[PDB]
Amino acid sequence: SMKLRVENPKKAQKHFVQNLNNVVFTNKELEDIYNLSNKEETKEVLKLFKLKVNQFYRHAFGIVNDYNGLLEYKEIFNMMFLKLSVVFDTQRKEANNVEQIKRNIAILDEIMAKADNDLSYFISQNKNFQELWDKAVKLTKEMKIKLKGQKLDLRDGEVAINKVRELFGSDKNVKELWWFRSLLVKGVYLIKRYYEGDIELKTTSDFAKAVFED
Amino acid sequence: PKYVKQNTLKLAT
Amino acid sequence: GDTRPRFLWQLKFECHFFNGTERVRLLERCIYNQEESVRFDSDVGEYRAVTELGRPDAEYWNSQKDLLEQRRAAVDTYCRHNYGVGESFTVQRRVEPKVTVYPSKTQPLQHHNLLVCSVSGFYPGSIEVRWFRNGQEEKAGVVSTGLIQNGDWTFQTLVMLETVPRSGEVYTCQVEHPSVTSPLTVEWRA
Amino acid sequence: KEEHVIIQAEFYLNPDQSGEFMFDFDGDEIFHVDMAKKETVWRLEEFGRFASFEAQGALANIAVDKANLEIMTKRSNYTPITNVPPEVTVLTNSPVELREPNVLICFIDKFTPPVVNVTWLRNGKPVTTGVSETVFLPREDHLFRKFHYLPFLPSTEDVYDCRVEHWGLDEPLLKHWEFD
């Protein structure tokens, strides 16, 4: 039914860490870490490290952006940062060890992969979420057609919501679930971009991919 | 054979 | 040099096995510094605070039905599982002891007072070692270091006999251990 | 009447920011996960040829542990741990014999927190080549054990000693050894 980021997810366990509130590192925080890598010889790998920390952040928020409707997403998001925090422990005591900085980078990747697995696992165990997430794609695809010749002036970010209320504002799921209605509101901005000839859409998110894929 | 662990649980609040 | 206060958090999951895996008991405990606060005893079926500081945690976890069922099944999915994974090189691990006998002086002034029976590099730690003076078992004058675990999956122990070996006598150190069907022996002619 | 005990023990210590994930069988270490490299290391190579473990899982656990340590420290109103000095002892692997390869074992027992500096000395000179050590092993009283090793060639002209430094000690503890 719904495509997972990992087809056959390996068992995942929750540590009940969804209620943490400040897992994400601030810039000053990250900078104070980058600063430890003060030696010359390590300045090249320090770039690859900063680049990975960024890819990391984008990855994490990417998950909440696509799956905020899935209860277990806070668990996955928070775990990612709790793990990052451990890697940073090593980074702080190995600030100029290029081989270590490279291992850490490799681990930051592994942490992301694990996140995708675990996410796929929790999704597989929540058939209901799947039905809802698929239905959201279903209607966004219909909306892709429905708005074929209409005027979409989304400049003030007001029309999108109206259109969703106009075409599906009576759908039980669009009234009751904010996340579901949002996937559709998010969808019309995508459709708009599609019409303007945007070609990267499918790479924008799992949702965008599921929507604009055939 | 794979050793399997027990997940750590986060404390109260 | 470092005079800063430290704070320690430990978590231990103990699997206790009896008669193979007939009876298994899981003990999950949380330790702050040097004091257990909360724990899950499979014999109980749910978290119980051990100190005041544990209460919040015992209360919170216990309200997670999914979590409790897991822990309750852990005895099988975790303990019995892991027990199998390593059985061949742990429970079955057998390393024959190396027995040798050499004299020694109880004091720098004393004569060749005691004989030492060195039993080393064996595993499991369960072993038996007895002294015999001309076929007759000796007990009254034995002293030992007790069983010693080396930390590399092997044990060693020294068993001494407090007797000035008179000429003509043949002392014998007999060692019995799982790694060998017939007891090991080392004689020492007076 | 219990026959065996398999213990999964892990810890996180502040402000050092040092953690440990290990499996224990009847007192001996089966393996542990090197936190820095995030990978399983077995106590005996042989073990790896028959079993495995996802180091990534340990990372997850130590990640949560860290967060818990903060929560507990605060909830306890920042109560620091009471240093308990180690009991050091040194003996050989097997009976010593001139020029016959042997090993020196330094047993550091009953202590906490899990932080300790160890140094091997031969006639006053710090020795290294050959040395090894086990990670921090857990005790039922919630204190720790640790072993350090120094392979050596016996000789009637060497005096070795294991130097152990721990916060619970007034001065560096220095246990001697020299065939005696």
The Cα-based distances of A127 to A9, A107, A209 in angstroms read 14, 31, 20
Rounded to whole angstroms, the Cα distance separating C32 from C155 reads 32
Fill in the DSSP letter of residue D81: P
Tokens of D117: 């500096």
Domain count, chain C: 2
A149 and A82 assigned to the same domain: no
Which residues pair with residue D41 across a beta bridge? D32
Domain that holds residue D19: 2-80
Q: Is C93 marked as binding a ligand?
A: yes
Q: Are residues C111 and C179 in the same domain?
A: yes
Q: Which of D35, D52, D80 is the last residue of a domain?
A: D80
Residue D86, judged by CB atoms within 10 A of its CB (0-12, 13-18, 19+), counts as buried
| Nearest alpha-carbon partner for A65 in A214, A189, A194, A195 | A189
What resolution in angstrom units was achieved for this structure? 3.0
CA distance D75 to D95: 52
Q: Amino acid identity, residue C57?
A: D
Q: Of the residues A125, A140, A159, which one is the last residue of a structural domain?
A: A125
Indicate the SS3 state at residue D25: strand
Domain holding D43: CATH number? 3.10.320.10
Which chain B residue has the Cα nearest residue A20?
B13
Residues C88 and C165 in one domain: no
Q: DSSP label at D80?
A: P
Q: For chain A, how many structural domains are there in total?
A: 2
What residues of A are in contact with residue D17 (Cβ under 8 Å)? 89, 92-93
Same domain, C117 and C83: no
Does C66 share its domain with C125?
A: no
Mark which of D53, D80, D107 sits at the end of a domain: D80
Q: Do C65 and C130 fall into the same domain?
A: no
The three-state DSSP-derived secondary structure of chain A is: CCCCCCCCCCCCCCCCCCCCCCCCCCHHHHHHHHCCCCCCCCCCHHHHHHHHHHHHHHHHHHHHHHHCCCCCHHHHHHHHHHHHHHHHHHHHHCCCCHHHHHHHHHHHHHHHHHHHHHHHHHHHCCHHHHHHHHHHHHHHHHHHHHCCCCCCCCCCCCHHHHHHHHHHCCCHHHHHCHHHHHHHHHHHHHHHHHHCCCCCHHHHCHHHHHHCCC
Neighbours of D76 (CB within 10 A): 17
Report the alpha-carbon distance of residue C145 to residue C118 in Å, rounded: 10
Q: Which of D7, D14, D78 sits opposite C14 (nearest CB)?
A: D7
Same domain, C82 and C104: no
Measured CA to CA, the distance from residue D58 to residue D65 in angstroms comes to 10
Distance from CA of D125 to the nearest CA of C (A): 22
Distance (Å, rounded) from C-alpha D143 to C-alpha C10? 10
- Helix pair angle (A98-124, A45-67), 10° resolution: 10
Output the furthest CA–CA distance in chain C (Å, rounded): 76
The domain that holds C113 is classified in CATH as 2.60.40.10
| Bridge partners of residue C54, in order along the sequence | none
Asked whether the beta carbons of residue D25 and residue C83 sit closer than 8 angstroms, the reply is no
Tokens encoding D15: 């402000």
Same structural domain for residues D60 and D144? Answer: no
Helix (H, G, I), strand (E, B) or coil at D60: helix
User: Which tokens hold the place of C60?
Assistant: 């919170």
Query: What are C83's two structure tokens?
Result: 């027990």
- Token readout for A157 is 């970010």
Structure determined via: X-ray
- Mutating which of C7, C77, C85 best tests the D interface, going by the most D Cβ atoms within 10 A? C7
Please tell me whether residues C80 and C49 are part of one structural domain.
Answer: yes
Rg (CA), chain C: 25
Q: Are residues A10 and A109 in the same domain?
A: yes
Taking the C-alpha atoms of residue C49 and residue C56, their distance in angstroms, rounded to an integer, is 8
Place of tokens 């030992």: C144
Cross-chain residue pair C13–B6, CB shorter than 8 Å: yes
CATH code assigned at D113: 2.60.40.10
Task: Give C140→chain D minimum CA distance, Å.
Answer: 25
b/e code A9-26 from CB counts within 10 Å (16+ = b) = beebbbbbbbebeebbbe
Domain holding A200, by residue range, is 126-214
Q: Is residue C114 located within the same domain as residue C186?
A: yes
- Domain containing C165: what range? 93-190
Examine the domain organization and report whether C2 and C48 are in the same domain. Answer: yes
Q: Which helix (H) or strand (E) holds D6?
A: strand D4-14
**A131 and A61 both lie in a single domain:** no
Name the phi and psi angles at A150, rounded to 5.
-65, 160
Residues in chain B: 13
Tell whether C76 is in a known binding site.
no
Please indicate, yes or no, whether residues A114 and A160 belong to a single structural domain of this protein: no
**Statement to judge: residues D163 and D86 lie in one domain:** yes
Claim to verify: residue A200 and residue A97 sit in the same structural domain: no
How does DSSP classify residue D44? S
State the residue for tokens 């180091």: D55
* Judgement on whether residues D53 and D87 belong to the same structural domain of the protein: no
Same domain, C62 and C117: no
The answer to whether C177 is a known ligand-binding residue is no
CB proximity list for C163: less than 8 A, separation 6 or greater: C113, C114, C115, C133, C138, C141, C171
Closest CA of chain C from B13, distance in Å: 9
Q: Tell whether C103 and C190 lie within a shared domain.
A: yes
Statement to judge: residues D24 and D107 lie in one domain: no
